[PDB]
């Protein structure tokens, strides 16, 4: 069984991340945060949680909605960097593969910001400190891709993912950079699924396979619903943007690659059982966040598994989205939709 | 905790404590020793 060899190098990590799980805000703590009047009341009410004394040394009057999520994210990222420094062998590779997906978003953000002639220093902020890679600010030169890959991207770990990307030889606009980002993310999800299948042991293997399948399915549905808009894409040129894994791959990605209107997407998801309750709703991303949280809650029942390191990392990032949504309503007096946070724990 | 009485006094006094921690942190980078009055007698002791 799995507990025999797991705790030789991952027992301290397991115990620390389960203790990190225990600081997730339950449903009553969000109600107590919702009842706050001003933002100092939100600070006092968050001081009685496992965030406690993190907005110390700020002010009583320099407290802003942006600053709250900056500090609440920096806490999360220091915790991730603490767990990754205590890992070795296969867990270190697992956490580097978690990091690469943020590196891709930093790459697309830097290339997009270079085109619109703006400052390098303002693209270097708002640029997600977890996927850093020290040679990143060198991407602000030489606005075509062939002078990017041949100078700075071959040394990055994103270098194997630029295989399907060299069909243009010109400069870049907002459409081409999103095509490059979707192709990089396809190659990333397929390589990380292949790493999970061949090298992670079983109770974490099946959990990470269903979590990465959910990530691939959400990418596929959003690429299909962002391609029926004011554009014209050949249907075999769109099947190169959909990842080859998940539970809607071998049939429904054939139909999503050919959907011409909004009713072609509802017809493609009508056959899959876990979906087709999603396209008649309020928000569409509030189904994906809810289903991701029900998947992450189910991953905390497996006790000897490193999927927990995923399931914590996505849950805590949901939590920082909730607090901001409360802090955007207290600072702006918009209490009408304040109870639309997403809470499972 | 934000609805109890005597919470504005706590906010004022730990604003003062925040500023005193800033003073102690600013006594680093310029190595100046704290005074450390070792008369722990005029507050605690006999008579209570």
């Amino acid at each position: 069984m799995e507990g025999v060899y797991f705790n030789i190098d991952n027992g301290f990590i397991e115990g620390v991340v389960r203790g990190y799980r225990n600081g997730l805000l339950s449903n009553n703590q969000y109600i107590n945060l919702t009842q706050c009047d001003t933002l100092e009341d939100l600070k006092l009410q968050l001081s009685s949680t496992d965030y406690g004394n993190f907005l110390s040394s700020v002010s009583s009057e320099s407290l802003t909605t942006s600053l709250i999520q900056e500090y609440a994210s920096s806490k999360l990222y220091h915790e991730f960097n603490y767990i990754r420094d205590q890992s070795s062998g296969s867990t270190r590779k697992f956490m580097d593969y978690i990091t690469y997906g943020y590196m891709i978003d930093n790459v697309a953000l830097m290339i997009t910001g270079t085109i619109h002639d703006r400052d390098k220093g303002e693209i270097l902020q708002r640029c997600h400190p977890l996927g850093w890679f020290d040679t990143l600010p060198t991407l602000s030169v030489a606005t075509d891709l062939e002078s990017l890959y041949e100078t700075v991207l071959v040394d990055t770990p994103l270098a194997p993912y630029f295989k399907n990307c060299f069909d243009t030889a010109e400069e870049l606009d907002d459409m081409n950079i999103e095509i490059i980002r979707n192709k990089l993310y396809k190659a990333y999800l397929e390589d990380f699924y292949n790493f999970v299948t061949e090298e992670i042991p079983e109770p974490a293997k099946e959990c990470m396979q269903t979590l990465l399948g959910f990530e691939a399915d959400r990418r596929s549905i959003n690429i299909a619903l962002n391609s029926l808009q004011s554009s014209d894409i050949d249907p075999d040129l769109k099947s190169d943007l959909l990842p080859n894994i998940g539970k809607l791959y071998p049939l429904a990605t054939f139909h999503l690659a050919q959907a011409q209107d909004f009713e072609g997407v509802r017809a493609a998801l009508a056959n899959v059982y876990e979906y087709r309750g999603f396209l008649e709703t309020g928000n569409l991303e509030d189904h994906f966040y809810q289903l991701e949280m029900e998947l992450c809650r189910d991953a905390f029942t497996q006790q000897f598994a490193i999927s927990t390191v995923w399931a914590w990392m996505k849950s805590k990032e949901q939590e920082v989205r909730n607090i901001t949504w409360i802090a955007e309503c207290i600072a702006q007096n918009q209490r009408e939709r304040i109870n639309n946070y997403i809470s499972v724990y | 905790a934000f609805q109890r009485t005597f919470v504005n006094e706590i906010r004022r006094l730990d604003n003062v404590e925040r500023q005193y921690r800033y003073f102690y942190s600013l006594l680093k980078k310029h190595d100046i020793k704290l005074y450390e009055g070792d008369t722990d007698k005029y507050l605690d002791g006999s008579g209570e």
Binding site: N53, F54 | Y20, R21, Y24, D40, D44
Partner: peptide, 15 residues
């Protein structure tokens, strides 16, 4: 009760 607080055990204890 009251006790002596010793600021270095209170500056590192906060942040």
């Amino acid at each position: 009760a009251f006790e002596y607080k010793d600021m270095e055990v209170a500056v590192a204890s906060a942040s």
